[model samples]
Target: LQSMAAQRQRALAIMCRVYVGSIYYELGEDTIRQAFAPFGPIKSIDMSWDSVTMKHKGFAFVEYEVPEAAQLALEQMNSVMLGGRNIKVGRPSNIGQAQPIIDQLAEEARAFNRIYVASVHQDLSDDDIKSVFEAFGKIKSCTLARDPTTGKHKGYGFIEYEKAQSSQDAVSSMNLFDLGGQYLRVGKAVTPPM
Candidate 1:
């Protein structure tokens, strides 16, 4: 039982910034603005720059005039491919730990669709891996560990899908899948390697 004015204040307090990650380095601010402006009035699009690398950090923050616009963009833009990269859209992760339970819950939920595909065959390219894994659902990103110098795959990688059901289906059906004389160990990627 809250007053109308109090409810209005609560609505106004909703977060209006959407975090966009895994973007292509070559994409510019105008490209990001073009991708998000259709949703609503955009306040700004801020891209992080790395002076050392002299390029974008492959992420940006898009602010909207209203929280509803931000929410709509978050719901619709996640896993949308642009410039050969599927951008990840979500609320910013950095916040005070005032609500630990919800924070941890969402942290787990965000990563539930990421699967670690271990023992990948060195000869199999990223496209090959996608050919195998994409049968389950739309793959958001298919990353393979590779040699820094020789630029060869190191026989392991992470594949994230837009839907958790796709990840589950891939893991359930493909764990220990034999491909090119190697058995892939497909499992949920709970935490990333440091």
Candidate 2:
């Protein structure tokens, strides 16, 4: 019943808190609080200050009164530009205690929201890729790799969706999709650092 245990563990770990990262150390607490407040009522935020550095930590834990609030924040707040930086939201890795399952869920959530698309036609521009991917859902970003020297398409790119369901839909429909005579290789991507 090892697999059964995994299911039970995930069930036990209610997603009532969200981890926020990639924020500026000087960012105001009010700014962070307001950002998540749109989703639901926030119970608490653990945004600590580094006494040694005399600056706020670049990350925080946001707890919501309702689990759906945190869930919505994880879906909508990730990769959003906030206070001059792109913010990231995921399930908190360690909330008061260690739980390997929480970290695993964070990893899974990140993977689900982003996807890799390879074998793009050299002629396709960023907008071309955007046009193709817009059907799935709101795209957080569509990064087409380009040559720094020649400034040309590198035949690959990444697409990030605001929601995991949309990313999953794109992954399912676009894998091996032929575009401009080149079969596109599409799969989940590792969430890149901001």
Candidate 3:
């Protein structure tokens, strides 16, 4: 038990950077510096953008003085809307590894074909969730319901699959599974078009 606790602490110690995603604030640097500076010393701030157009990639990375500060920022800042955009905060993982995880989860969820998912976990990103369900078939699109007022994920969404069979496959395979400690209800969508 002590060893496990020590390992958890070590893991937390290495998590000094927070990945802020889906940001809509145009005043990028100011917003980040202002929001995170109070927590602790900020080592660096980086806002990603498209190389060709220099448009914001809707995400940023903030490295703090230590993991404790970073974890505090994530706890305090997640789901907080700034400048009309709800932000998501978490530790950064290797993008290279992320793709494979996405692919694997997508497959298990059978999201490759035209699949629709309901009762999705709010923290799951469209890309990340889509990737998880992508392994079964090709994903036409994945939609997560967001609050109109706050613009934050509303704890549910839909993933459209290309074929009915794939959607059915996803429904059969990935219903009621634990994701990130949240039990997700993955199945067909039921709603009339607005």
Candidate 4:
């Protein structure tokens, strides 16, 4: 029992070892990422779980991003408003010790392709939703959220594709367009590390 418990802990650590404290807790990761995107690429942002909420930890972790283009970000995004306050830029206390693990997570994240699609019509069937997005690429799975009480759709869904590129393409081509008579808001379905 002792070894099993230790093994379980070790496994959990390997799976997740990441959070960020945010002043902009209410703002979404995508918004923040885009706010900073003008300077350079954002490797990733870790906003702890708010899929239209039921989540958030008042903070987040960001790759802030690739260390290669240091100056552009430092000059532009530093003190930029995030959640109506300036975004701070600084090095993590132990960055030297964390690169290998960060790189590993970045690579692992690249292999997964998921997207968040909103503004779905409540009356549209899951199959109806799936067929529209499937035209972009092969979908691994698609889920339209249902209300826990009534089991009716809540005007949003997630679609996972075999390749990340397909998810990207779908976002560019399908977003803000009509589907089931409702305009959609499609983007990468990013759920932060809890």
Candidate 5:
């Protein structure tokens, strides 16, 4: 149990539990997404489900994009009800008590340093966009995201440099710098965890 707690904690440092059963099975990621997303974007949810029934194993592992949201949630959303289950949210704990296993804080939290740049000007063509990121390093690709159907620019884009350091440098230098009309918000990129 101690090793398992350590293992779980290593994955992430924050989450809550919904007792495994019908209530938990019914409300899974969607429930957590809708209820907690406004606090801040979420990073991931670690879950295990039943083999035969294929239902979630009752509890969950939730991690937010920002650590502050984790604190905000533990403060503001503790014991919130979904289907009469006062969902028990716990900050990463690991001193196991023979009940649900909890764990400790994880050091490596952010998944990657993929750069998210927004407020891109429609005037900047893809080549123009890629050119800007070249100053940092040899990034994998620089994309000015577009509306798939309309083929219009989405006014934002992404770049993946060779190293996270390059991405951080881009963020430090580019954020609040003007592209067209709006200032660019250079920051780390994230999508829902796998």
Candidate 6:
């Protein structure tokens, strides 16, 4: 009996952070509740919003009772389409230190003058990207890719600079920072000449 109880406790230690996009206020709490209930008892769930605007932050954290439950949630939900948006699931990290994993392509092309940033904060616009990088140096061009059907930002884009130094500066400085509640991954682009 003691061994069984210990095993159960071990399974409950898994705690993960789940990212849900395009989440609406009416459905956000329910969706999160249902999503994590199957794994085990949820330890705590938190959703933050602007006090003045009262809008959903479009992301949340779900801490499970056990590690196994959290692990299961992460494995099952990462990149899974949900609520009209793709969901990202993983372990929670320190607020300021939580960084998105940049695709390998971005890392390999870091030396280039132009950098493609993926996993951008969906709320960011082309002008916003330009403005942020402009602080480092002159921006030749900044483009935010959008979905043609809905005309919404695809949460990724590219920034071109006359000098690679500026691009590197942006990468180092902006990593893991919150842009309207979403964490961004800034890095270099690897697309070949078309």
How would you encode candidate 5's per-residue C-alpha lDDT over 1-194 as one tens digit per residue? 99975755544343432222223557886786666553344567666567798877777666664443454456546668876687776654542442232222322223444666655677888788678777987787777667789998766666777777887788789876776676665665532122
What pairs collide in candidate 2?
Answer: none
Runs with alpha carbons beyond 4 Å of true place in candidate 2: 1-112
lDDT of 4 by residue, 39-129 (tens): 3334577666667856775555555222322223443345557777665654344444445544554455445687666667767888898
TM-score attained by model 6: 0.42
Q: Give the residue spans of candidate 6 off by over 4 A.
A: 1-112
Give the alpha carbon lDDT tens digit for every residue of 104-145 in model 6: 223445555665554456567889778877898888888776
TM-score leader: 4
TM-score for candidate 3, residues paired by index: 0.42
Q: How close is every model to the real structure, measured as TM-score?
A: 0.44, 0.44, 0.42, 0.45, 0.43, 0.42
Where in model 4 is the C-alpha error above 4 Å?
A: 1-109, 192-194
In order of listing, the candidates' clash counts read 0, 0, 19, 5, 3, 9
Instruction: Give per-residue CA lDDT, model 1, range 74-136, as digits (tens).
Output: 766898999988999987776433234333333554554877665677779999999999999
lDDT of each: 0.72, 0.72, 0.64, 0.59, 0.59, 0.59
The per-prediction CA RMSD against the true structure, in angstroms, equals: 15.7, 14.8, 15.6, 11.0, 11.0, 15.4
Of models 1 and 3, which has the larger lDDT?
Answer: 1
Position 96, candidate 1: lDDT:
39
Ten residues in a row with the worst lDDT in model 3? 185-194
Model 3: per-residue Cα lDDT over 69-139, one tens digit each: 56457666788888888888887865443444333333444333333343456567778777878777777
